Design an enzyme around this catalytic site. Structure first.
Site, PDB file in Angstrom:
ATOM      1  N   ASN B 137      37.751  16.326  16.759  1.00 41.32           N
ATOM      2  CA  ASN B 137      37.931  14.952  17.458  1.00 41.32           C
ATOM      3  C   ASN B 137      39.391  14.631  18.069  1.00 41.32           C
ATOM      4  OD1 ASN B 137      35.832  14.797  15.119  1.00 41.32           O
ATOM      5  ND2 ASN B 137      35.177  12.790  16.397  1.00 41.32           N
ATOM      6  N   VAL B 144      40.932  11.007  21.905  1.00 40.41           N
ATOM      7  CA  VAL B 144      40.288  10.457  20.652  1.00 40.41           C
ATOM      8  C   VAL B 144      38.868  10.555  20.729  1.00 40.41           C
ATOM      9  CG1 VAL B 144      40.567   8.491  18.939  1.00 40.41           C
ATOM     10  CG2 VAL B 144      42.564   9.123  20.318  1.00 40.41           C
ATOM     11  N   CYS B 145      37.938  10.993  19.688  1.00 41.61           N
ATOM     12  CA  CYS B 145      36.594  11.111  19.946  1.00 41.61           C
ATOM     13  C   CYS B 145      36.471  10.319  18.731  1.00 41.61           C
ATOM     14  CB  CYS B 145      36.148  12.602  19.711  1.00 41.61           C
ATOM     15  SG  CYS B 145      36.721  13.696  20.981  1.00 41.61           S
ATOM     16  N   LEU B 146      35.607   9.057  19.122  1.00 41.23           N
ATOM     17  CA  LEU B 146      34.966   8.169  17.966  1.00 41.23           C
ATOM     18  C   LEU B 146      33.841   7.644  18.491  1.00 41.23           C
ATOM     19  CD1 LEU B 146      37.764   6.438  15.691  1.00 41.23           C
ATOM     20  CD2 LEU B 146      36.202   8.197  15.135  1.00 41.23           C
ATOM     21  N   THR B 151      33.484   8.051  22.596  1.00 45.78           N
ATOM     22  CA  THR B 151      34.010   9.364  22.880  1.00 45.78           C
ATOM     23  C   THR B 151      33.414  10.219  22.040  1.00 45.78           C
ATOM     24  OG1 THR B 151      36.078   8.742  21.845  1.00 45.78           O
ATOM     25  CG2 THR B 151      35.860   8.475  23.957  1.00 45.78           C
TER      26      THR B 151
END
Ligand SMILES: O=P(O)(O)O[C@H]1[C@H](OP(=O)(O)O)[C@@H](OP(=O)(O)O)[C@H](OP(=O)(O)O)[C@@H](OP(=O)(O)O)[C@H]1OP(=O)(O)O
Ligand SMILES: Nc1ncnc2c1ncn2[C@@H]1O[C@H](COP(=O)(O)OP(=O)(O)OP(=O)(O)O)[C@@H](O)[C@H]1O
EC number: 2.3.2.24
Lengths: 1012, 293
Positions: B137, B144-146, B151
């Site tokens: 992530n 930032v991957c959340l 994202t």
């Protein structure tokens, strides 16, 4: 043939069949007061093949106040009104054969001459001959469509009668809906379940056909009627006899004709079919009918209209209305107030209402000759009684004639209100058809004519175009490319020489706020918006809210329209409306999984923009940032990670140098789009590929594509390659001739052309149906080494001059034909649709969708704008909240709905105190004035304790910040960091809630002056 | 053992504070005193600030100042410009047992005009030249991957909510999902490789790489080249954690050598072990040099 460049917007409303009907239409109109002139103008703008105008009366000085073509010379010569206005109306449309007539009409007049016409319109006519004409027209085969309308003061009447049976071919202008089917059960009746993310959007009794159904393959082409079961399901009749359902299926709406029955005029006087415009007072139209019939009886008996303030006339009219009501079926209570006001304003003529009802009647005529929309059945009445109702009980001296060009309006509204109108300062933004006709209405009303104050300000940056000539009636073909505002102003001085008007060529936006500053806003009184977009409406609404000035707005969408009224301290604002954000097509849907025609159209539009607008601009920008190919080579040799240099070199290495290379580039792009990408996608997902649950991958909405072999003999391929080659040669600046576009030359080139073969790849398909636009894949080694080799070979070939390093950037032209953008986008969209087994779309529909062109007609403009002007009078009069009426209409039904505007909401803050959007607190200060002083002053002045203060985006004080109690002791003139632009600053405050931990309750904006 | 309690007591004064970002003349010419990701977007934002945005930011600031996460394992540090609001920066300590153990990670956060309609923009700046993909992530550039940030893959309920979602929840999600002991399995398809020696072995490789990268950037570069915003705070943190830093790095050296027993992936583990030992010697020099701040 249809003049598309003139008529496209109306075409998108009516459809080619409607215009083809009007190509054979003959219409007769008699009576040339303001109403008749407006109706004639609307019909001529529409494009009726032949119009026969008629009048038997001569020009009065009184008629000058009700006409925008007549002159004092016409009155002096006592010319008959018909041929007098015939000269001017001929300029409106050369394609229309306009004729005139002056035969006196009476009981002994033979009506056989009317047989040539399909629709006949009467104004200012006596009722018995109306009855005779109605009997004559309905007895013809086919019956002549009969329409009668009249205007008296603040009252109007509209009636239509299309015979015993009137055929309707289309009941609504909307496209037939298509719904993806999730499941259908085998039952009697079968239960049809849609893809239940989207609602059913259909009604019981509607008619459908079905296609691309699997499992129940017998339903392919089946034709059923429906009954709604749920907001996501419905039944279509027995399906038990059918085979089991497996998958697929789309329900398609079927348009069905209809027939509406009209009664004779005389028999419709009793039990009249009335259309309600105010559901809170549905009894009012019947009262208006009774009062109008009483007025007709009075006119028949005495051969004159009642005089203003004549108590005997009002009493006689009331007696007649009471007697007539007793002969009606319902026998409602006669509204004595309505009768009194009708008697008071009998001799007047109120122009905006006349224009509105004229537009409505024009649309009814349009329906009568086409059957395109459901017509009125049969009576319609509009009122302006709200204006006089707020006057209480005025006296006749206000309304008595005085010999000017405004006596007709004076008899309606009173002299003092006319003086108020003449003193008005009106700022109009935008100069579309709405702006032009509003300026015309103001000229008719004498608004902004007084020497001391009355001034009208207009501004618009656009220039006049041929397509705008269809509904912006002021302009002419030789006015093309001239500024809209200037020409519109110049035309209006012809209508009224007493006007005081200023015009500007400026777009209205924050950058131009300096010209239209708050001092300019203060000088104005009311602001009218004729915009076509939402953001400018937001900006104007915010400005007028900050300046506390009334605002009016109107939106038009085909037969649909609406009006918005905003008054300070009374209503909400436009920035109160929170209409949901519009639809977004998913990136995966547009790039890889198009299920509808619009998806392919959008894909073609975006690809055209990227290819010819975006990428050439990027190339030019790159070769402006960097100057030498050898310099770029030296940079990349030293490890410079230049942006897009790889793609720039790829484009340059593919730069054609002659027409044949341009054509082969177009052909290889065709191959890439239409075989290679489809083959790659099918390589990733074969037809039999299935999901994790084992269900079909290529099932609704996922339509499986199919690669297409090129063939020059196909007209679609021919046009696509021709347009692509032309556009590429334009970008690459390669000259060519029209002979190079010949199919023979293309065949000769293609015989030399060889096509590269397809290869499969592992590019990841972004199947995610909610996927956003991703980022680029980083530069692989192949990219930079190929870039180096290709730039070196370009240097060897000497393709490094500024001509090689820059190209042409093409704008998105959408109306001209020679640019060929429309042809190219239509061809690409049709190819892509054919790939996914999607029906191709025609050029006109593609132009409509791709250009986001709003289908519009001048009649709806005039209809909504008459009401807008009416509300402008009420705003001028300062009437209470009850008078102002927001309104919506849809002439396709037809339907009109008046409604009270949204009341201003009192924003309770604390301890019973409240504020509104019509509020902005102020505090006068001094050099030593501090933030603690500011907080204490706010608390003292408004009885509420501030908690936190912010200057725009910038925090000024927050209690929970370290050491910010010191900021309280600091002085405004230092902590604010003020500019010299103002004597003040604007800021935001919140206040403590009753419950601890709740976010502080926001208050009104607060302005702090630096001086006293 | 009182080290944890003293850690909580001391730096709770240091969790929440403001530090000055924007530098201007009286004419409003925007400049910046430190490194920040979104310099251009600060100047290119629209100044018609919505009051809801500012009030939400103030309430969130109060909520953070009252309830910031705090433990020597995992902690959250809040700094914002003393004058502007939407510009934001965070510092996060990696929990124990993770390849991020006791490292620190500085973030750049921006708030759009429409906020709270959309989630704030978040990006990690501790990626060290923006080359280390510290998480499935968290790519090399620091993206930032959340799900809550829209994202990362997930359900709409797991995604942003203008009314219910709060930045503190975002920070908690970062701590609980990003700084984990099994970051290799975070990528889809690698949680499926779990339960097999091949998947565990690849996790060994990835976690050792993450360990050495953290020792390089998140500790060594964070003390030798600290951002002035958290400069004193990071030094105090590492001074209090210096003993456990030595214990953890010795344990990582011992464990990475266990992974080095393999023939080929153990060779990559040997490279990571050499890098780890070099950075451990450097960090040991720093710990010997570092006094009580
Ligand atoms: O850059 P865009 O205009 O958005 O479209 C590109 C472009 O296609 P065109 O050749 O039709 O312009 C790429 O080609 P180049 O610009 O690099 O020559 C191609 O990439 P490939 O050359 O690798 O095929 C890519 O396709 P993809 O995203 O599948 O790699 C495709 O994108 P679209 O599918 O959005 O047109
Ligand atoms: N911010 C603005 N300030 C001033 N004028 C504006 C602004 N936004 C839009 N306009 C004007 O609004 C007008 C819209 O007119 P209208 O709806 O009749 O269509 P059009 O723009 O003339 O043509 P089309 O049919 O191609 O959309 C334009 O002439 C444009 O100049």
């Amino acid at each position: 043939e249809i003049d598309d460049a003139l008529y496209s917007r109306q075409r998108y409303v009516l459809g080619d069949t409607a215009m083809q009907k009007m190509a054979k239409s003959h219409v007769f109109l008699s009576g040339m007061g303001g109403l008749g002139l407006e109706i004639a103008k609307n019909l001529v703008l529409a494009g009726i093949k032949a119009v026969t105008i008629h009048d038997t009366e001569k020009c009065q000085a009184w008629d000058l106040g009700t006409n925008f073509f007549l002159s004092e010379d016409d009155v002096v010569n006592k010319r008959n009104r018909a041929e007098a206005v015939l000269k001017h109306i001929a300029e409106l449309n050369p394609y229309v054969h306009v004729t005139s007539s002056s035969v006196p009409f009476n009981e002994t007049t033979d009506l056989s001459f009317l047989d040539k016409y399909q629709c006949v319109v009467l104004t200012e006519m006596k009722l018995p001959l109306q009855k005779k004409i109605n009997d004559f027209c309905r007895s013809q085969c086919p019956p002549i469509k009969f329409i009668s309308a009249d205007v008296h003061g603040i009252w109007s009447r509209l009636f239509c009668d299309f015979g015993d049976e009137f055929e309707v071919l289309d009941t609504t202008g909307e496209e037939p809906k298509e719904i993806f089917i999730s499941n259908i059960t085998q039952a009697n009746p079968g239960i049809v379940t849609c893809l239940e993310n989207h609602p059913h959007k259909l009604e019981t009794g509607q008619f459908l056909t079905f296609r691309e159904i699997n499992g129940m393959t017998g339903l392919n082409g089946s034709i059923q009627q429906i009954t709604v079961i749920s907001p996501f399901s419905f039944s279509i009749g027995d399906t038990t006899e059918l085979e089991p359902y497996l998958h697929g299926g789309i329900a398609v709406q079927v348009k069905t004709p209809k027939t509406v029955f009209f009664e004779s005029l005389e028999r419709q006087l009793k039990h009249p079919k009335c259309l309600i415009v105010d559901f809170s007072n549905p009894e009012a139209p019947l009262e208006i009918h009774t009062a109008m019939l009483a007025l007709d009886q009075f006119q028949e008996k005495y051969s004159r209209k009642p005089n203003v303030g004549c108590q005997q006339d009002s009493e006689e009219l009331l007696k007649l209305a009471t007697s007539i009501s007793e002969t009606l079926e319902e026998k409602p209570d006669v509204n004595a107030d309505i009768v009194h006001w009708l008697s008071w304003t009998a001799q007047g003529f109120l122009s905006p209402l006349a224009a509105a009802v004229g537009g409505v009647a024009s649309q009814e005529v349009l329906k009568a000759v086409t059957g395109k929309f459901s017509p009125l059945c049969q009576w319609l009445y509009l009122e302006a009684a709200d204006i006089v109702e707020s006057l209480g009980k005025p006296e006749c001296e206000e309304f008595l004639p005085r010999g000017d060009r405004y006596d007709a309006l004076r008899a309606c509204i009173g002299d003092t209100l006319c003086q108020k109108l003449q003193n008005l300062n009106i700022f109009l933004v935008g100069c579309g058809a709405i702006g032009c006709e509003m300026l015309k209405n103001f000229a008719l009303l004498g608004v902004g004519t007084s020497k001391e104050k009355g001034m009208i300000t207009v501004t618009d940056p656009d220039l006049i175009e041929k397509s705008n000539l269809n509904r912006q009636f002021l302009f002419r073909p030789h006015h093309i490319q001239k500024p809209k505002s200037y020409t519109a102003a110049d035309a209006t001085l012809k209508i009224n020489s007493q006007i005081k008007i200023d015009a500007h060529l400026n777009k209205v936006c924050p950058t131009t706020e300096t010209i239209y500053n708050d001092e300019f806003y203060t000088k104005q009184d009311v602001i009218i918006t004729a915009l076509d977009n939402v953001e400018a409406r937001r900006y104007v609404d915010s400005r007028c809210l900050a300046n506390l000035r009334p605002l009016l707005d109107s939106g038009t969408m085909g037969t649909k329209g609406h009006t918005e009224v905003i008054v300070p301290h009374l209503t909400e604002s436009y920035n109160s409306h929170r209409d949901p954000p519009e639809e977004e097509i998913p990136f995966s849907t547009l790039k890889s999984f198009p299920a509808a025609i619009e998806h392919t159209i959008q894909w073609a539009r975006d690809k055209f923009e990227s290819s010819f607008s975006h990428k050439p601009s990027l190339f030019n920008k790159f070769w402006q940032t960097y100057s030498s190919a050898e310099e770029v080579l030296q940079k990349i040799q030293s490890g410079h990670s230049l942006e897009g240099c790889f793609q720039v070199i790829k484009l340059l290495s593919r730069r054609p140098r002659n027409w044949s290379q341009c054509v082969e580039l177009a052909r290889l792009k065709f191959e890439k789009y239409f075989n290679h990408k489809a083959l790659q996608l099918l390589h990733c997902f074969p037809l039999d590929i299935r999901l994790k649950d084992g269900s079909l991958f290529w099932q609704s909405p996922k339509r499986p594509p199919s690669p297409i072999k090129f063939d020059l003999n196909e007209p679609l391929h021919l046009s696509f390659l021709q347009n692509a080659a032309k556009l590429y040669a334009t970008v690459y600046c390669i000259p060519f001739a029209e002979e190079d576009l010949s199919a023979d030359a293309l065949l000769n080139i293609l015989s030399e052309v060889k096509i590269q073969e397809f290869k499969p790849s592992n590019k990841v398909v972004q199947t995610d149906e909610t996927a956003r636009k991703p980022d680029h894949v980083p530069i692989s080694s192949e990219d930079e080494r190929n870039a180096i080799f290709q730039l070196e070979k370009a240097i060897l070939s000497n393709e490094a001059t500024k001509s090689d390093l820059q190209m042409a950037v093409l704008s998105f032209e959408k109306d001209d034909d020679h640019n060929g953008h429309i042809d190219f986008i239509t061809a690409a969209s049709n190819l892509r649709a054919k790939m996914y087994s999607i029906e191709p779309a025609d050029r006109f529909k593609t132009k409509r969708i791709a250009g986001k062109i709003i289908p519009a007609i001048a009649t709806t403009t005039a209809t909504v704008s008459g009401l807008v002007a009416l509300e402008m009078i009420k705003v001028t009069g300062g009437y209470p909240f009850e008078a102002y009426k927001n309104c919506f209409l849809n002439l396709a039904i037809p339907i009109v709905v008046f409604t009270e505007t949204t009341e201003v909401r009192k924003t309770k803050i604390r301890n019973g105190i409240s504020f509104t959007i019509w509020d902005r607190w102020t505090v006068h200060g001094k050099e030593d004035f501090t933030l603690l002083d500011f907080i204490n002053a706010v608390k003292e002045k408004y009885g509420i304790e501030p908690t936190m203060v912010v200057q725009g985006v910038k925090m000024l004080y927050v209690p929970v910040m370290p050491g910010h109690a010191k900021r309280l002791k600091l002085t405004m003139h230092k902590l604010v960091k003020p500019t010299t632009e103002k004597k003040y600053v604007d800021l935001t405050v919140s206040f403590a809630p009753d419950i601890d931990g709740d976010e502080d309750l926001p208050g009104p904006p607060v302005r702090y002056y630096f001086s006293h | 053992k009182s080290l944890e309690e003293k850690y909580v007591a001391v730096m709770k004064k240091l969790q929440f504070d403001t530090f000055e970002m924007v530098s201007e003349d009286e004419d409003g010419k925007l400049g910046f005193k430190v490194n920040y990701h979104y310099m251009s977007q600060v100047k290119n934002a629209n100044d018609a600030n919505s009051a809801a945005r500012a009030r939400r930011l103030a309430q969130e600031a109060v909520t953070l100042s009252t309830s910031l996460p705090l433990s020597s394992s995992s902690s959250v540090f809040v700094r914002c410009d003393e004058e502007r609001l939407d510009i934001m920066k965070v510092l996060i300590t990696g929990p124990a047992d993770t390849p991020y153990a006791n490292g620190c990670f500085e973030f750049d956060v921006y708030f759009p005009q429409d906020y709270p309609s959309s989630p704030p923009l978040v990006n990690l700046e501790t990626t060290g030249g923006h080359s280390v993909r510290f998480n499935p992530n968290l790519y090399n550039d620091g993206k930032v991957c959340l799900s809550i940030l829209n994202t990362w893959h997930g359900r709409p309920e797991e995604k942003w909510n203008p009314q219910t979602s709060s930045f503190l929840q975002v920070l908690v999600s970062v701590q609980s999902l990003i700084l984990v002991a099994e970051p290799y399995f975070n990528e889809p398809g690698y949680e499926r490789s779990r339960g097999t020696p091949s998947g565990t072995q690849s996790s060994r490789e990835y976690d050792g790489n993450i360990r050495q990268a953290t020792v390089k950037w998140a500790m060594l570069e964070q003390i030798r080249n600290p951002s002035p915003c958290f400069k004193e705070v990071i030094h105090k943190h590492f001074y209090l954690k210096r003993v456990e830093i030595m214990a953890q790095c010795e344990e990582w050296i011992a464990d990475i050598q266990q992974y080095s027993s393999d023939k080929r992936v153990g060779r990559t583990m040997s490279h990571h072990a050499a890098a780890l030992k070099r950075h451990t010697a450097q960090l040991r020099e720093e710990l010997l040099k570092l006094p009580c701040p």
